Symmetry: D2
Subunit: 171 residues, 4 copies
């Protein structure tokens, strides 16, 4: 069987618009952590990697980065952070928040380790999809509930490496 | 420099496992299913012997973990939400690690969470962790065997020994 | 939708573990120290029982791998393997596909020696010819549970090996 | 110590275009490319490079620690029958990459290749095949663009020499 293309992708947010938003988020984060000397940025794999890579290069001061892998089902830790959390300023960095369910469970687990502070930063937010009230400190774009990919977001492990955010559109 | 001397014999442990199993079986008599979770590596021998005496629909699972920080090196594979969960441990002394594990598991909203330890050193307690089932209450002796190591050795002793 | 029927009693398993320990202990007579490495979750009861019968300076460890779909390491061993005598301890071998990948992974770490012990072997299922040094029982291709082996996560805690009658 | 730019962000950017053209030509005929990075050092290079690679691309990550190379987190994605590209920020001794390449070869990828942004050929202690190299550099003490000194400097947008 030959499988014909069944969808295409159309740019929704360009690489340049994302770059602009990162400048804004970095101004907000840098201002927020002005009186902090060290910041630990924790990304959730796989989706946060592109965003974390770009953002971390704009954050000032002593910055450390780390990653965790969790399952979306209870939230299971597939890979924990390698850094100590207690007494540290911690910023969780995520590509997209929709339901909030995963981020809320990750927040709760980290809070147990008594960071000095815990904040959450998401590039994209679908506020319509929210199912639990998780506090998000820094938000890039507010978007409708579209089928989106790119800049770390996959569909069937495809499109994670698009430099822009696209919606997946049927023929 | 050191040697080992038997403190609690294999036969004494065997008798206490029957006593623990009766308490556990009575406690979960009305439960749909029980998930028993051991912490690696120390819990494996105790868990292996104990789970064989527990009635009903039993599943077993393991975690590996290594102050408020904890690192989860391996989480449980099984679902926790809405299930009866029994944490199975060889020895509780400070309770520091167990308390952190208990707190993390509580976030997953098990129907119930309980703790069983073969050995308890109550004089060593540094945090108030609730312990539901205890085999033997012991002084702070330097002990190995039945899963408990010194520098990774002696976990395979069938008895609990004092290191002399 | 199903029942169980005893295939190997707890007594028969106990007797076979004595035979296996005799073989293992004789095999490692000259060994300074042995690392026994069990695969989770299936090997845990067999490991617990067997390790208590093995002589000398013994250390135990565990790994968790996904079933062969690649064989992925979900939890690696904590111990160093390089230059150690290592015995992999498994509940059951059938296709051999998973154990073959595990053996290969451990060989890459350059142990002093590597050997494999399985309590149960279904040789009519073998797809890859992984060398096994110690075998407890050779069994027909039956739907089996108990002594660490599950059906849908149930029955791992049965103290005997049982056939499921569907 | 202090730091001094050795390779600018613009220079890295120019080289990533060169690397991307080589990779894109090499994999023009590929059904699925899987790019695999080692945490944490490869994340920045991976993020930049993957955005320039054409076709069906998936990315994944492993965490390994050297003593044996133990797998702290394996890839989530399937390797068997796929074209796989290991993406690394720096190769010096090659020891860890050689063990990683060997482990991935066991999974029978269609093809396996290695790309590094930086190579210190004079530091090589094992013969690992490297298919794509960005910059060949002397054994300078360096940080930035994912490479740390005691966990610091990973977020520098350029590659800096540490001058003590």
């Amino acid at each position: 069987y030959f499988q014909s293309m069944k969808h295409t992708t159309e740019v929704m947010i360009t690489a340049e618009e994302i770059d602009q938003k990162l400048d804004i988020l970095a101004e907000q984060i840098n201002a927020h952590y002005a009186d902090s000397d060290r910041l630990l940025m924790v990304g959730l794999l796989k989706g946060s990697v592109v965003f974390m890579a770009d953002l971390c290069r704009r954050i000032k001061g002593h910055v450390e980065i780390d990653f965790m892998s969790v399952s979306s089902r209870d939230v299971k830790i597939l890979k924990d952070v390698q850094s100590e959390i207690q007494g540290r300023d911690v910023l969780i960095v995520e590509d997209l928040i929709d339901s909030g369910n995963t981020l809320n469970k990750v927040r709760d687990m980290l809070l147990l380790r008594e960071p000095k502070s815990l904040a959450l930063c998401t590039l994209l937010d679908k506020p319509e999809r929210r199912e639990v009230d998780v506090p998000v400190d820094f938000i890039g774009f507010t978007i409708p509930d579209e089928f989106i990919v790119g800049y770390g977001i996959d569909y069937a492990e495809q499109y994670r490496n698009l430099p822009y955010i696209a919606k997946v559109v049927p023929l």
